[PDB]
UniProtKB/Swiss-Prot annotation, chain A:
GO cellular component, one term: virion component
Domain of life, source organism: Viruses
Protein family (similarity comment): Belongs to the baculoviridae C42 protein family.
Stretch of the intact protein here: 113 to 334 of 361
Coiled coil, from the record: none
Oligomeric and partner information: Forms a complex with proteins E27 and p78/83. The interaction with p78/83 mediates nuclear translocation of P78/83. Interacts with protein Ac102. Interacts with IE0.
Compartment list: Host nucleus; Virion
Record-given protein name: Protein C42
Organism of provenance: Autographa californica nuclear polyhedrosis virus
Curated annotation (Swiss-Prot), chain B:
One Pfam family in the UniProt entry: Baculo_ODV-E27
Gene symbol of the encoding locus: E27
Protein's cellular compartments: Virion membrane
Lineage, opening ranks: Viruses, Viruses incertae sedis, Naldaviricetes, Lefavirales, Baculoviridae
Superkingdom, natural source: Viruses
Function: Acts as a cyclin-like protein and plays a role in the modulation of host cell cycle. May promote G2/S arrest by interacting with host mus209/PCNA, cdc2 and cdk6. The cell cycle arrest is characterized by an intact nuclear envelope, concomitant with sustained activity of host cdc2. However, viral DNA replication still occurs in the arrested cells.
Protein name: Occlusion-derived virus envelope protein E27
Record-stated family: Belongs to the baculoviridae E27 family.
Keywords: Host-virus interaction, Membrane, Modulation of host cell cycle by viral cyclin-like protein, Modulation of host cell cycle by virus, Viral envelope protein, Virion
Amino acid sequence: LINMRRYRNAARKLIHHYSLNSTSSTEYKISDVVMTMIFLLRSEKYHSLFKLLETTFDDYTCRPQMTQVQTDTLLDAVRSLLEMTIDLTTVDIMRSSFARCFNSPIMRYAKIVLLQNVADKRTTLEELLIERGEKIQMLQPQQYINSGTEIPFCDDAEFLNRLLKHIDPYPLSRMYYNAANTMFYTTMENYAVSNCKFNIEDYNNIFKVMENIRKH
Amino acid sequence: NKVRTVTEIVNSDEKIQKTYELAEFDLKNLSSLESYETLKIKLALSKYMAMLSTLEMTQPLLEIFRNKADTRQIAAVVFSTLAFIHNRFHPLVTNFTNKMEFVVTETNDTSIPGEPILFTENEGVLLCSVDRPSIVKMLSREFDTEALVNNCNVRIAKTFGASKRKDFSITEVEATQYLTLLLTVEHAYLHYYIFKNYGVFEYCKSLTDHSLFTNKLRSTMSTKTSNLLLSKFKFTIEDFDKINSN
Amino acid sequence: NKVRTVTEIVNSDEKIQKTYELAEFDLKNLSSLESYETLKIKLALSKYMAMLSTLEMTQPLLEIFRN
């Protein structure tokens, strides 16, 4: 027999990381992958996801074909597992990530990678800019405010103090880490879905700019 | 490094020499600066939360952004954040002058990766484009409320010197959500500032490469304006060099 | 390409230099010319359609040429 609960927990954590649904970062290992796959196999509920991932053992550079019922079942299973919302885009992201992991060879140093092979034609940032901007200009403003107005600043100093107390035990370091990684992962997902190369250089140039402004 | 002092009486030659290691004062200074910066940032975050409350929207932030129908509240929140950042850079400004338009995209072919909030004029007035799906995705991504983030000698010294102390729906998760929204709107505001003050071509070039931000902003930001929120920490991509080589 | 301007007071030597990138004005000019040409061509086409209507032929153009 197996500790299906522990298997499930490891599976959930690994799936979260490989679907970029959690900013949490931790070590992972072949033990964890095996936990995940065994849990999926044993669970009647998740047989479809098990089949999906098992198919990654092959060339894995392919788009699985599913009926609408199959896709709905898979999405329901994933959403029940992670308790969230989700998307077949996330399904494909997990498929690609797990395929890369399975095809990867045993190693001593965890392979740091970026998102790749999600959602055929490679598009540049410039082409995306042109097309998206044209479509946006086509779009019309859903709502607007008039000129001037006034920022509605709060006034209750006691209220501000209460909020300050409520937030004091929150570590700014952890909050900053979580926020930055959230933004980074969402940008990664957008790029991968768009099939446009992610400019790691410019993404880091953002922080370079932050530092260059700070130093002055 | 170190210093030393000598005491001596005018009429006598018996002098007493003492030596001081500046590391202690360095620790004092670093702790003071860290505490001051933490207090400033928490004050700003609380102020942002408080003004959003002043708007008096019943739902919480994430629910607001999930409710696709109520574009009114999305626009209100976005504009309020943008104006707050604008004032934080120009405290004397409490409005935004020119009226503002808003649109909430709903599709990938309508959204631009890496710039969920952007700006474009209709040749008469500026329109702000919002990627509500992306905002929802960011604010919904599960956050880590457990792991910690980070010279060992000064680390130990701070550990042993500094102390610790053992009805709002806000948890660290919601605080993180607010901070993420603020940072995103700050990025968008920097883009918009470069646009307004350097032309649409410069705005497009910045979108292509943010590096121009360095000069186009530090010319005015680092001197007259409160430092960027991100300035609180130095950020970096894990395994950046190998990733670049990839 | 680019240009720059210098402001200075007659009695003072404190001068302020600003730089301009002509690409913005180039975009303005190109958009203006494109719009003007589009308007001219559409005006001519509308005028042509209108005079053909003035001839007052019942059928549409393609039907006319098919008959």
